[PDB]
Amino acid sequence: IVGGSDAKEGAWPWVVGLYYDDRLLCGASLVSSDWLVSAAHCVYGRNLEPSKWTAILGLHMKSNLTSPQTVPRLIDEIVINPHYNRRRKDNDIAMMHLEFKVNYTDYIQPISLPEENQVFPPGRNCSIAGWGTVVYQGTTADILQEADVPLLSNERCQQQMPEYNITENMICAGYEEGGIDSCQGDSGGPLMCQENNRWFLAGVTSFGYECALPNRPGVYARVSRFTEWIQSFLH
Numbered sequence: 455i456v457g458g459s460d461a462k463e464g465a466w467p468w469v470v471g472l473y474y475d476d477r478l479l480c481g482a483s484l485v486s487s488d489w490l491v492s493a494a495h496c497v498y499g500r501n502l503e504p505s506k507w508t509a510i511l512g513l514h515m516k517s518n519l520t521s522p523q524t525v526p527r528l529i530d531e532i533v534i535n536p537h538y539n540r541r542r543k544d545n546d547i548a549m550m551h552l553e554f555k556v557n558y559t560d561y562i563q564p565i566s567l568p569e570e571n572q573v574f575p576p577g578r579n580c581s582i583a584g585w586g587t588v589v590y591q592g593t594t595a596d597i598l599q600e601a602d603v604p605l606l607s608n609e610r611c612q613q614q615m616p617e618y619n620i621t622e623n624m625i626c627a628g629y630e631e632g633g634i635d636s637c638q639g640d641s642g643g644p645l646m647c648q649e650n651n652r653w654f655l656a657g658v659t660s661f662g663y664e665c666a667l668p669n670r671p672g673v674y675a676r677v678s679r680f681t682e683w684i685q686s687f688l689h
Contacts, residue, residue: 455582455588455600455601455636455637456589460597464514466598468644468646468655469481470509470510470511474500474506474508475506478516478639481640484511484564485565485655486689487552487556489687490509491548491549493675494540494546498538498540501534502532504529505528505553507550509526510526514561515597515598527552527553527556529550530552531549543619544621544623545623545675547680569654574678578604579604580605580645580656581603582601583599583601584636586599587639605626611673614626614670636665637665638665643658656674657677658674658675659672660673
């Protein structure tokens with residue numbers, strides 16, 4: 455996360471860090487007691503031995519090794535979206551199953567999927583959080599970083615990203631002046647939006663051109679487009 459600041463413990467209790475070969479590579483969001491939502495590009499091509507992935511839930515600072523609120527879980531199934539197109543970056547979303555369920559606490563809670571026909575309006579600020587790079591081509595955060603970013607319309611995002619195919623399956627967020635954005639290592643994490651005192655998972659961190667440039671917004675997979683499919687896994 456570029457231009458954000460340290461989160462407080464408990465700030466975003468659905469945010470989960472995903473480890474592979476001992477490195478936190480991507481974020482993910484807890485959506486039930488045993489399913490995460492993350493990005494397909496994070497796991498694509500390396501999902502079929504799913505026990506190589508570990509989720510840490512209730513995570514705040516990577517270096518805090520005596521944290522009693524963090525809970526590890528092996529992953530035992532990873533399902534990429536059946537429409538995912540790697541070349542086009544379209545449908546960039548995956549489901550990951552926790553080997554054993556988690557009990558919810560102030561530090562571990564699921565985030566709601568969007569309500570039917572919920573609108574997340576261009577111009578509204580939503581929040582992002584992750585342990586990825588703090589500046590473009592910089593280093594990964596220790597303490598979870600958070601920031602707020604405004605949504606764009608897809609028309610405006612496509613004009614700013616003419617090199618890319620911005621589809622109905624994507625939602626974009628960032629500032630005209632740049633400075634605040636998701637970055638490498640944040641992929642898979644939530645774009646989350648508040649309505650009526652409740653948080654909804656509006657997007658999943660997907661891609662962008664570099665990070666935090668002016669007039670270059672972050673692109674996220676639009677979760678409302680996948681709610682039926684995500685629901686298909688749940689108990």
